[PDB]
From a paper:
Schlafen proteins (SLFNs) were first discovered in regulating mice thymocyte development, and then found to span across mammals with great diversity. SLFNs were reported to be interferon (IFN)-inducible, and their functions have been implicated in various biological processes including cell differentiation, tumour suppression, immune response regulation and the restriction of viruses. All SLFNs share a specific N-terminal AAA_4 domain (Pfam04326, termed N′-domain in this paper) which has a very limited sequence homology to other known proteins and was reportedly involved in tRNA manipulation for certain members. Investigation of the structure and subsequent functional analysis reveals that SLFN13 is a novel tRNA/rRNA-targeting RNase with potent anti-HIV activity.
To gain a functional insight into the Schlafen family, we determined the crystal structure of SLFN13′s N′-domain. 15 vector-encoded residues fused N-terminally to rSLFN1314–353 are clearly discernable in the model. Mutation on any of the Zn2+-coordinating residue rendered rSLFN131–353 insoluble, suggesting that the zinc finger is crucial for the folding of rSLFN13. rSLFN131–353 constructs were eluted as monomers in the right-angle light scattering (RALS) analysis, whereas the crystallised His6-tagged rSLFN1314–353 was a dimer. The dimerisation of His6-tagged rSLFN1314–353 is likely mediated by the artificial N-terminus. Surface electrostatic potential analysis of rSLFN13-N revealed two positively charged patches inside the valley, whose width is exactly suitable for accommodating base-paired RNA. Substitution of conserved charged residues (Lys38, Arg39, Lys42, Arg217, Lys224, Lys276) to alanine resulted in reduced nucleolytic activity, suggesting that rSLFN13-N may embrace base-paired RNA within its valley. Apart from the positively charged patches, a negatively charged area formed by conserved Glu205, Glu210 and Asp248 of the C-lobe is also observed at the rim of the valley. Mutating any of the three residues diminished the nucleolytic activity of rSLFN13-N and hSLFN13-N. Even at elevated enzyme concentration, E205A and E210A mutants were absolutely inactive, which differed from other single-point mutants (D34A, E47A, E84A, E96A, E146A, D193A, E221A, E229A, E249A, D259A, E323A, D350A) regarding exposed and relatively conserved aspartates or glutamates. This result demonstrates, that Glu205 and Glu210 are pivotal residues for the endonucleolytic activity of SLFN13-N. In addition, this plausible active site appears only in the C-lobe but not in the N-lobe, suggesting that SLFN13 cleaves only on one site of base-paired RNA.
Residue numbers in the entry:
A (entry chain A): -1 to 112, 120 to 159, 179 to 351
B (entry chain C): -1 to 10, 12 to 112, 119 to 160, 180 to 247, 250 to 298, 307 to 350
The structure:
């Protein structure tokens, strides 16, 4: 006993070759609901990587062992199903995943995926400036984006109101500001977090979204509610370090071109002096980012494939696009 | 020191049939906040003990209390409830008396046995088609069932609109038909669960109820009254016929007459798959599985009862 043969059953048809072992995983919504929060997300992220790689590599099966062996839950759970269904763009998970529970083992069969997207992904990692929601474009939104920028190839930046404060040589602490957070103007306020580290985290999501949608301005050091100019303290940062952190941060952004141009994202960063009252309190950082030729990503797309020789691996930025559409 | 003679006390004769359960916790206060997996385990262990005693004359079940230091005097509501379901009269007081002696706990069980069942059972693995009641027949309903079928020997077969989908030869969505979920038509939809494992799980319970109630049609892959079916990739037509034939085969049947034939059924798989089962009315009784009931004695130990002898305890 304690031994389970891998695909026991009357079925004699051709058995899967690409299989994946996710180790020990707890199943059933009751056990998963009040289990360790950290352990849940690791198993959740583990299965989604496996299922995503199977969808993109010609089908397979996910093998795993049950930590809560004795229950026989016979259902995947809510958190696991919702992440697997979100992977599939048509959300018809019942057509692509089947589960079999065999004693101490649990299988998740995943069928291959090959006006609809060609690959499945945990996150498209590309953002647009949408007032509705700052979530990354889902499979449907992403496919419309890349095909449109490909077919299109076969100022407002300078006249928008945000230019004058982007052209201010000096600002004053506490001054209210005539613009609001629009589709071209984003307000971000500093915390007790170091200035450079907070900029490095905010840059990839917002500079990317601006470049994909008519450009815009990103202001660091302004409250959202109070809409007051406060900036960050002067002492631990200088003008060269803030501009260098931005330049280092923008450079890491991967871009994919549907055209002959290889220009990376063009921007103009400025550090504006904020005065307390005859004393330099600190700085206010504004970044003007121009519209882009094709696509700008906040990072590499989170999407996986799996082969027997190569194992499970992540996809580069550009071939992920070529696997995504018909280039 | 820590030693207990089993039937201490001046006034107790000591019972003959003593069965020993392991370490169990007692008390509604303590049993409420114990490990969930052990609580159900001790329940099925004590309930199995009581059922075997009720059917095997006088007896007593002895157990050692986990929570030694405190002293309860109550089994807990869940143990009382499980024993009530064993006694068809539900008069717990007249058949159970509990005594606590140090770290030991006794449950004295009175022998069992108007027109009432002669044997007690945890659950009869026999199902019938009761509207808003898809539970197995309790002790009295089962006795009323078997006695009705037992007197029948010593003394609708129509084409339901589901016949059209049974002979549909082709499947497509919607296809809602004049028949809805009836007393002879049950709908079951496939989930992300594999097709074989689900059918193997649903067949015994529902095929039993249909065969015992004028027959019927079992539809796999119908939500909503919508047709969904099962995916094509992991399943072949020959497998569905095979798993149904092997699953219905092990369903135990008992005849009150000379017929030894098993229940007649006809399976049919419609493509693009939808599994439909035509099951005919049965001569006597079809069980979903072996009836869950025990007896116990010294030469034999604690043993489960075969399907045949269990029914004969409902005979004269
Ligand atoms: Zn371009
Ligand atoms: Zn018969």
């Amino acid at each position: 006993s304690g031994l389970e043969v891998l695909f026991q059953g009357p079925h004699m048809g051709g058995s899967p070759d690409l299989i994946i072992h996710a180790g020990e995983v707890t199943l059933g919504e009751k056990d998963r609901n009040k289990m360790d929060s950290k352990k849940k997300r690791l198993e959740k992220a583990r299965i989604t990587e496996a299922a995503c790689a199977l969808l993109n590599s010609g089908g397979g099966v996910i093998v795993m062992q049950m930590s809560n062996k004795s229950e026989h839950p016979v259902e995947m759970g809510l958190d696991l199903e919702t992440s697997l269904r979100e992977l599939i763009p048509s959300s018809d998970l019942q057509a692509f995943i089947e589960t079999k529970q065999q004693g101490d083992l649990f299988y998740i069969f995943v069928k291959s995926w090959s006006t609809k997207p060609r690959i499945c992904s945990l996150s498209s990692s590309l953002y647009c400036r949408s007032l509705t929601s700052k979530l990354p474009l889902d499979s449907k939104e992403t496919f419309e984006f890349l095909e449109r920028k490909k077919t299109c190839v076969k100022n407002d930046l300078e006249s928008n109101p945000a230019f004058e404060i982007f052209q201010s040589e000096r600002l004053e602490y506490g001054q209210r500001l005539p613009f609001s957070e629009s589709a071209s103007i984003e307000f971000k306020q500093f915390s007790t977090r170091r200035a450079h580290e907070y900029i490095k985290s905010v840059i990839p999501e917002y500079i990317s979204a601006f470049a994909n949608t008519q450009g815009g301005y990103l202001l660091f050091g302004v409250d959202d509610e109070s809409k007051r100019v406060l900036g960050c303290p002067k002492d631990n940062v200088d003008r060269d370090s803030l501009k260098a952190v931005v330049n280092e941060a923008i450079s890491k952004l991967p871009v994919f071109h549907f055209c002959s141009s290889k220009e990376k994202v063009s921007y103009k960063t400025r550090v504006i002096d904020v005065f307390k009252e005859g004393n330099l309190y600190g700085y206010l950082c504004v970044i003007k980012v121009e519209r882009f030729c094709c696509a700008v990503f906040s990072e590499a797309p989170i999407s996986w494939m799996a082969d027997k020789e190569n194992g499970v691996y992540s996809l580069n930025t550009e071939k992920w696009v070529r696997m995504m559409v018909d280039i």
